[model samples]
Target: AVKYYTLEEIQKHNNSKSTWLILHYKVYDLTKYLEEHPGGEEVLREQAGGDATENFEDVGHSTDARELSKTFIIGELHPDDR
Candidate 1:
């Protein structure tokens, strides 16, 4: 089954120290991914604490990046928001 999260819940982690990304309304705690990002720190750091959907697609993340996203996905996009 698909889990869901609220924007309020997603907002709880809105900083580099405890980052969560809202891509396609999906919540992903990327705090652990900060350093491991192959694109380098600034790339994701710039996107830290906010929606990376535009940035994520603009850069055209590789196939590996797409798959890797699944590993950190905490929940699906909320329905009303989606």
Candidate 2:
């Protein structure tokens, strides 16, 4: 089962060295994936340690992008929106 983290807990990772982002109710640790990202590190860091689901979905993540997301899963956002 996926782990879950509170927003406050998520905020602790806000940085290039330990970046974490909440997206679509899932928490992703993108620290290791920065260089591999097409958008570049700064773009991803803009909303680090906070909710970026809207920004992510706004791009209408392609099938490949969605698939790639799983590799970074650290947990789920506590308190699902629904």
Candidate 3:
């Protein structure tokens, strides 16, 4: 089952050991995917531990990229936090 997380908890994952970000209220653990990202790691790292919805959409990712994102989704922002 999917888990929910608070922004405080998500923020703690920003460092090298882990990286998480929010996209449209859904949370994604991109630590493993970071190195493999086609756009390069820095762009993702810059948004780590925070909402990346705008940046993610601004680039207009391909359909494949959007589909691939599902694999990284671990949960969503807790309703209380949203």
Candidate 4:
């Protein structure tokens, strides 16, 4: 199923340091890495809840990495759905 959170909800999660990891049609919690990642935390924050394929592509992450990333997507939150 597809679910979309309001901007307010997304912001709240962002503020709370919620991890917005996407996996297929599911979203996972990566909040624990808010400060431990090699990449800057801001990159993750900037792509939160938005289509981040371009960012992923730029990083030269493998298709497996991309697939792994999707493992955390809670649901479909594309703007086009509205």
Local distance difference test values of all predictions, in order: 0.78, 0.86, 0.94, 0.55
Q: What range of 10 consecutive residues in model 4 has the weakest lDDT sum?
A: 21-30
Q: Number of clashes in every candidate structure?
A: 0, 0, 0, 16
lDDT tens readout by residue for model 2, 6-72? 8888888986579999888889999988889987888788889899988888878799988999999
Taking the tens digit of each residue's C-alpha lDDT, what string does model 4 give over 1-82?
Answer: 5776543444345545475643332344457665654677788776665445566567787766555555455554445433
Q: Which stretches of candidate 2 lie over 4 Å from their true place?
A: 80-82
Q: Candidate 3, residue 46: CA error in Å?
A: 0.7
Residues 1-82 of candidate 3 have per-residue lDDT tens digits of 7689999899998899899999999999999998899999999999999999999999999999999999999999999988
Of the two candidates 2 and 4, the one with more favorable TM-score, higher being better, is 2
Model 3 residue 6 CA deviation (Å) reads 0.6
| TM-score: the better of candidates 1 and 3 | 3
Provide the RMSD of all predictions against the true structure, rounded to 1 decimal. 1.8, 1.8, 0.9, 4.0
lDDT of 1 by residue, 1-82 (tens): 8888766677667664788878877778888888898888677666665678998888888898899888888887678866
List the candidates' TM-scores in order.
0.80, 0.89, 0.95, 0.52
Q: What is the TM-score of candidate 1? A: 0.80
Candidate 4 Cα outliers beyond 4 Å, as residue runs: 21-29, 33-42, 49-51, 78-82
